[PDB]
């Protein structure tokens, strides 16, 4: 029950805790975030950072409240306030990273960056089958989009815990992968730690004792004597679940994933679920860890598979994992989350951040707003990674489609810059996508969340609402818009006339 | 709770309630049977019958106790004692059947009787696959055994509630069936009402509200407002389950079974599970029925598929369902159960009774006792139906195998008699396999359970222990041993020399 009360410095702004709460930051009066047993649908870290160079860390979960002008933090373990003497957000980030999540030196598979990614989810939903996957890949090529990583989403397998292609819908999965490889795609499969609880796989896992066990609500029952599996309710139903604390569960998962690589030529894995909330309640783990660390240990499996993607995470800052922003709705409100969510991700140690799925990642959001899809695409373009799912050729008229293609072209033109800073993030952990405050401290940018910096020298200001006018706040210095070539004096806000095709981006010239 | 308390008449013996308790009958001082929520692993009926022509019935479950010479019944509803004026077990049976379970007039598919049955369970266990099923069928024929109904047991499908062949182990299931048909087999599939609770099938059944719902332990929550499924722990794991009270569940189940017939040419179904114990607890059903009636209503599905087999049952006496004795251990104790279990089944309205599996039906009994297997086959031979699973040619040396073949041959010789009484049982409900007490009342046969009558005129006394001597208690009259032609006067016990090949059987000639 150790607690800490932190009066804000005059004008101080605080961010941290949870990627999927970044739209509620800087933390305001009234604000509350619970990290214990809750990653808020995405990545979370027991870190806060301030605009005055202050930081808070604990190795373990905490809760934070802002009441008036005071932070109140309640630690499950212990924590402390720190000050970096430089006095900026960047200093807080740099000191906290080097103490608590130093950069590993490694990158995820570069194929994840060197082309757009594509996910079968929106087009195929639960009907993941060989014919429709090949058609989607052919359509990507035929429409002039670059081959990249192709993620086959949930439901390619017979049941949860069976890591094989369902032969009814995949008559020749190895052939299919070989065709996809030929066309220039790499292939990832959706996986999770849940096991259909009346199957051969489930009975095998229970016999090996690699599942989480049911405590029966007993205060005394020990892991080694439990006999029944925990059953967990999640969005697809009711399942047994792997115990991430159990070294034998790691062996089993490796066997399954290594099998898919050897048998079918699979390049990597989209690791879904693992959310802390799934590990709450009457549950016994072999090494007696908490729900947050179950999530963290799921995340470590990716360290073995350079081509990976996670949505749920606890810690693992400074690690070679792709961290995707969670399922976004097909709304203007959600497109406006991409930048502040992604910039926060970077500060929490998640440099390799991909802003969900162009146009939305929630399949019941799919009435479609074509303009929204264009702006979504344009906003992805100069983020560290760009991910499609809904087919632009199916849902967009000809000029909207062209605009999306133009966004992809701008990404191609800027890729050497993206890769420079991506490779650097492996080494120093410094973010690829930086907030305005990170690069330009104490210059009035604390609440500017519709602009970001790609490295140090490119200011990107995606259009994220309807209208023909866009306001852009330029830091001191001179800035040259990379399309128009027009040079602007900095230290003011300019108004730009925009069309559907505009993606404002400025090179620092002073 | 309403009740009856019944002093036994002098010499009176009582049977009833539950097939799988018949070896504990006639009911002794200290006996207890609970039917409510419990079918004792097999069939159960709310009926008791006495050697003095008395009987007890209720529409609803009860519990029965014998303390001293008092038979006490505690009813969930209401019940009554009755007396048949003829004063014998046969009179009690006949009156009870005509009042409470009159014969339907119908037979199950005659192919279940006109040849031995075979079931892939013991030889293939959970590895049900096209190649091995066809090899077993070929082995049957190549060893000189007759083609019959072949039952493909659990695990032919991807997961529970997916009614399709798994293409990984069945590359051409329709072709396999067509081959089996050409070899003179008919084919049944194992089915159950459980649904893997994180699958597509589960989510469909949930959306259609055909599952049993979770009451949450609330005494007010109605079916109509419940949102979560009941999860049931059973021998294979944890599953959602069909609500047999829900007419929509009947439609769903018909769609699945009809589809298997139409698409692959499946002749019938082995309906497993449905045991009343699975329906206990915090459960809401659409028509607010009890656990026993959930078992009964599963049973009624077989009224639509003349080629059927059930193990779990409540009521449905007098109906065209094959009723299989439950999984028997590979023990002498269990072989000695086949006759009393089968004879009781008959008196409870289950004329069409098959005595589980030759040599045993419990896969973890599988030091095989060859003699036991032979005697098991010989005991099956003149029962209504005969069912193999373990491969006699694999586990028996040449003499023993030959003895099993001779048992099949005797069954073929006797088949016209079997079918005569089977056909009659559809009309009158009178059993095919009759207890000695039933045919010869008040003659000292009350506890003779190693002999039975095939209809009126054939007394069968299978050898059911080791040794070269068999004692046979003959009713008054004259009795002709069918092999030897020797005529024995009745009203006494004879001793017969026997070999491994002997199946003592006597024709009534007075
Ligand atoms: Cl969920
Ligand atoms: Cl069970």
PDB file of C-alpha atoms in Angstrom, chain A residues 139-268:
ATOM      1  CA  UNK A 139      -5.983  -7.699 -55.906  1.00  0.00           C
ATOM      2  CA  UNK A 140      -3.300  -5.868 -53.890  1.00  0.00           C
ATOM      3  CA  UNK A 141      -0.771  -6.438 -56.706  1.00  0.00           C
ATOM      4  CA  UNK A 142      -3.240  -5.796 -59.550  1.00  0.00           C
ATOM      5  CA  UNK A 143      -4.303  -2.465 -58.014  1.00  0.00           C
ATOM      6  CA  UNK A 144      -0.669  -1.353 -58.001  1.00  0.00           C
ATOM      7  CA  UNK A 145      -0.114  -1.619 -54.256  1.00  0.00           C
ATOM      8  CA  UNK A 146       3.304  -2.916 -53.124  1.00  0.00           C
ATOM      9  CA  UNK A 147       3.556  -6.478 -51.793  1.00  0.00           C
ATOM     10  CA  UNK A 148       4.354  -6.501 -48.059  1.00  0.00           C
ATOM     11  CA  UNK A 149       3.672  -8.545 -44.969  1.00  0.00           C
ATOM     12  CA  UNK A 150       0.304 -10.259 -45.236  1.00  0.00           C
ATOM     13  CA  UNK A 151      -1.349 -11.244 -41.963  1.00  0.00           C
ATOM     14  CA  UNK A 152      -3.903 -14.026 -42.033  1.00  0.00           C
ATOM     15  CA  UNK A 153      -6.178 -13.152 -39.121  1.00  0.00           C
ATOM     16  CA  UNK A 154      -8.235 -15.276 -36.746  1.00  0.00           C
ATOM     17  CA  UNK A 155      -9.874 -18.543 -37.830  1.00  0.00           C
ATOM     18  CA  UNK A 156      -7.401 -20.234 -40.181  1.00  0.00           C
ATOM     19  CA  UNK A 157      -7.158 -23.270 -37.830  1.00  0.00           C
ATOM     20  CA  UNK A 158      -9.717 -25.991 -36.782  1.00  0.00           C
ATOM     21  CA  UNK A 159     -10.032 -24.760 -33.168  1.00  0.00           C
ATOM     22  CA  UNK A 160      -8.103 -22.663 -30.598  1.00  0.00           C
ATOM     23  CA  UNK A 161      -4.952 -24.522 -29.640  1.00  0.00           C
ATOM     24  CA  UNK A 162      -4.740 -26.483 -32.891  1.00  0.00           C
ATOM     25  CA  UNK A 163      -1.849 -24.821 -34.822  1.00  0.00           C
ATOM     26  CA  UNK A 164      -2.600 -26.216 -38.278  1.00  0.00           C
ATOM     27  CA  UNK A 165      -4.482 -24.925 -41.327  1.00  0.00           C
ATOM     28  CA  UNK A 166      -8.049 -26.196 -41.508  1.00  0.00           C
ATOM     29  CA  UNK A 167      -7.917 -28.512 -44.547  1.00  0.00           C
ATOM     30  CA  UNK A 168     -11.567 -27.822 -45.457  1.00  0.00           C
ATOM     31  CA  UNK A 169     -10.676 -24.212 -46.349  1.00  0.00           C
ATOM     32  CA  UNK A 170      -6.920 -24.639 -47.108  1.00  0.00           C
ATOM     33  CA  UNK A 171      -6.496 -27.629 -49.492  1.00  0.00           C
ATOM     34  CA  UNK A 172      -2.815 -26.757 -50.055  1.00  0.00           C
ATOM     35  CA  UNK A 173      -1.624 -24.220 -47.474  1.00  0.00           C
ATOM     36  CA  UNK A 174       2.072 -24.850 -48.264  1.00  0.00           C
ATOM     37  CA  UNK A 175       1.348 -24.206 -51.987  1.00  0.00           C
ATOM     38  CA  UNK A 176      -0.580 -21.065 -50.999  1.00  0.00           C
ATOM     39  CA  UNK A 177       2.350 -19.730 -48.952  1.00  0.00           C
ATOM     40  CA  UNK A 178       4.785 -20.519 -51.771  1.00  0.00           C
ATOM     41  CA  UNK A 179       2.570 -18.535 -54.213  1.00  0.00           C
ATOM     42  CA  UNK A 180       2.355 -15.636 -51.777  1.00  0.00           C
ATOM     43  CA  UNK A 181       6.172 -15.636 -51.281  1.00  0.00           C
ATOM     44  CA  UNK A 182       6.588 -15.636 -55.092  1.00  0.00           C
ATOM     45  CA  UNK A 183       4.381 -12.561 -55.377  1.00  0.00           C
ATOM     46  CA  UNK A 184       6.681 -10.772 -52.884  1.00  0.00           C
ATOM     47  CA  UNK A 185       4.552 -11.179 -49.715  1.00  0.00           C
ATOM     48  CA  UNK A 186       5.679 -12.490 -46.373  1.00  0.00           C
ATOM     49  CA  UNK A 187       3.061 -14.205 -44.272  1.00  0.00           C
ATOM     50  CA  UNK A 188       2.053 -13.957 -40.662  1.00  0.00           C
ATOM     51  CA  UNK A 189      -0.600 -16.000 -38.782  1.00  0.00           C
ATOM     52  CA  UNK A 190      -2.830 -14.865 -35.945  1.00  0.00           C
ATOM     53  CA  UNK A 191      -2.199 -16.847 -32.743  1.00  0.00           C
ATOM     54  CA  UNK A 192      -3.367 -16.656 -29.121  1.00  0.00           C
ATOM     55  CA  UNK A 193      -2.844 -18.551 -25.839  1.00  0.00           C
ATOM     56  CA  UNK A 194      -6.452 -19.860 -25.537  1.00  0.00           C
ATOM     57  CA  UNK A 195      -7.355 -23.583 -25.962  1.00  0.00           C
ATOM     58  CA  UNK A 196     -10.788 -24.915 -26.903  1.00  0.00           C
ATOM     59  CA  UNK A 197     -11.460 -26.709 -23.617  1.00  0.00           C
ATOM     60  CA  UNK A 198     -12.885 -30.053 -24.805  1.00  0.00           C
ATOM     61  CA  UNK A 199     -10.308 -30.963 -27.440  1.00  0.00           C
ATOM     62  CA  UNK A 200      -7.231 -33.196 -27.899  1.00  0.00           C
ATOM     63  CA  UNK A 201      -4.983 -30.089 -27.610  1.00  0.00           C
ATOM     64  CA  UNK A 202      -6.664 -29.061 -24.386  1.00  0.00           C
ATOM     65  CA  UNK A 203      -6.337 -32.549 -22.836  1.00  0.00           C
ATOM     66  CA  UNK A 204      -2.661 -32.661 -23.931  1.00  0.00           C
ATOM     67  CA  UNK A 205      -1.988 -29.230 -22.353  1.00  0.00           C
ATOM     68  CA  UNK A 206      -3.813 -30.239 -19.165  1.00  0.00           C
ATOM     69  CA  UNK A 207      -1.790 -33.495 -18.944  1.00  0.00           C
ATOM     70  CA  UNK A 208       1.483 -31.528 -19.352  1.00  0.00           C
ATOM     71  CA  UNK A 209       0.192 -29.080 -16.755  1.00  0.00           C
ATOM     72  CA  UNK A 210       0.975 -26.056 -18.958  1.00  0.00           C
ATOM     73  CA  UNK A 211      -2.463 -24.456 -18.457  1.00  0.00           C
ATOM     74  CA  UNK A 212      -3.493 -22.019 -15.738  1.00  0.00           C
ATOM     75  CA  UNK A 213      -5.325 -23.813 -12.975  1.00  0.00           C
ATOM     76  CA  UNK A 214      -8.521 -23.044 -11.089  1.00  0.00           C
ATOM     77  CA  UNK A 215      -7.879 -22.053  -7.450  1.00  0.00           C
ATOM     78  CA  UNK A 216     -11.482 -22.909  -6.487  1.00  0.00           C
ATOM     79  CA  UNK A 217     -11.408 -19.677  -4.484  1.00  0.00           C
ATOM     80  CA  UNK A 218      -9.161 -21.513  -1.984  1.00  0.00           C
ATOM     81  CA  UNK A 219      -6.556 -19.449  -0.127  1.00  0.00           C
ATOM     82  CA  UNK A 220      -4.372 -22.503   0.412  1.00  0.00           C
ATOM     83  CA  UNK A 221      -4.599 -24.660  -2.717  1.00  0.00           C
ATOM     84  CA  UNK A 222      -1.192 -24.825  -4.434  1.00  0.00           C
ATOM     85  CA  UNK A 223      -0.455 -24.941  -8.173  1.00  0.00           C
ATOM     86  CA  UNK A 224       1.180 -28.339  -7.817  1.00  0.00           C
ATOM     87  CA  UNK A 225      -2.013 -29.881  -6.402  1.00  0.00           C
ATOM     88  CA  UNK A 226      -4.680 -28.209  -8.553  1.00  0.00           C
ATOM     89  CA  UNK A 227      -6.456 -30.458 -11.028  1.00  0.00           C
ATOM     90  CA  UNK A 228      -8.959 -28.288 -12.908  1.00  0.00           C
ATOM     91  CA  UNK A 229      -8.032 -25.707 -15.563  1.00  0.00           C
ATOM     92  CA  UNK A 230      -9.005 -22.090 -15.337  1.00  0.00           C
ATOM     93  CA  UNK A 231     -11.779 -21.319 -17.800  1.00  0.00           C
ATOM     94  CA  UNK A 232     -11.697 -17.759 -19.175  1.00  0.00           C
ATOM     95  CA  UNK A 233     -14.496 -15.843 -20.908  1.00  0.00           C
ATOM     96  CA  UNK A 234     -13.242 -13.712 -23.810  1.00  0.00           C
ATOM     97  CA  UNK A 235     -14.751 -12.251 -26.934  1.00  0.00           C
ATOM     98  CA  UNK A 236     -14.822 -15.594 -28.867  1.00  0.00           C
ATOM     99  CA  UNK A 237     -16.251 -17.572 -25.896  1.00  0.00           C
ATOM    100  CA  UNK A 238     -14.862 -19.805 -23.126  1.00  0.00           C
ATOM    101  CA  UNK A 239     -11.371 -21.382 -23.155  1.00  0.00           C
ATOM    102  CA  UNK A 240      -8.506 -22.813 -21.146  1.00  0.00           C
ATOM    103  CA  UNK A 241      -5.372 -20.674 -21.277  1.00  0.00           C
ATOM    104  CA  UNK A 242      -1.628 -21.192 -21.261  1.00  0.00           C
ATOM    105  CA  UNK A 243       0.333 -20.281 -18.119  1.00  0.00           C
ATOM    106  CA  UNK A 244       2.997 -17.865 -19.318  1.00  0.00           C
ATOM    107  CA  UNK A 245       4.908 -18.408 -16.072  1.00  0.00           C
ATOM    108  CA  UNK A 246       5.355 -22.086 -16.808  1.00  0.00           C
ATOM    109  CA  UNK A 247       8.589 -22.868 -18.732  1.00  0.00           C
ATOM    110  CA  UNK A 248       6.830 -25.963 -20.249  1.00  0.00           C
ATOM    111  CA  UNK A 249       4.181 -23.668 -21.777  1.00  0.00           C
ATOM    112  CA  UNK A 250       7.016 -21.790 -23.564  1.00  0.00           C
ATOM    113  CA  UNK A 251       8.305 -25.136 -24.856  1.00  0.00           C
ATOM    114  CA  UNK A 252       4.853 -26.092 -26.133  1.00  0.00           C
ATOM    115  CA  UNK A 253       4.276 -22.725 -27.824  1.00  0.00           C
ATOM    116  CA  UNK A 254       7.688 -22.878 -29.520  1.00  0.00           C
ATOM    117  CA  UNK A 255       6.950 -26.413 -30.784  1.00  0.00           C
ATOM    118  CA  UNK A 256       3.699 -25.150 -32.310  1.00  0.00           C
ATOM    119  CA  UNK A 257       5.094 -21.992 -33.903  1.00  0.00           C
ATOM    120  CA  UNK A 258       8.335 -23.643 -35.046  1.00  0.00           C
ATOM    121  CA  UNK A 259       6.106 -26.368 -36.602  1.00  0.00           C
ATOM    122  CA  UNK A 260       4.150 -23.821 -38.674  1.00  0.00           C
ATOM    123  CA  UNK A 261       7.458 -22.265 -39.846  1.00  0.00           C
ATOM    124  CA  UNK A 262       8.972 -25.624 -40.818  1.00  0.00           C
ATOM    125  CA  UNK A 263       5.902 -27.243 -42.343  1.00  0.00           C
ATOM    126  CA  UNK A 264       4.356 -24.342 -44.248  1.00  0.00           C
ATOM    127  CA  UNK A 265       7.115 -21.590 -44.548  1.00  0.00           C
ATOM    128  CA  UNK A 266       5.300 -19.063 -42.239  1.00  0.00           C
ATOM    129  CA  UNK A 267       7.389 -15.909 -41.666  1.00  0.00           C
ATOM    130  CA  UNK A 268       5.914 -14.811 -38.345  1.00  0.00           C
TER     131      UNK A 268
END
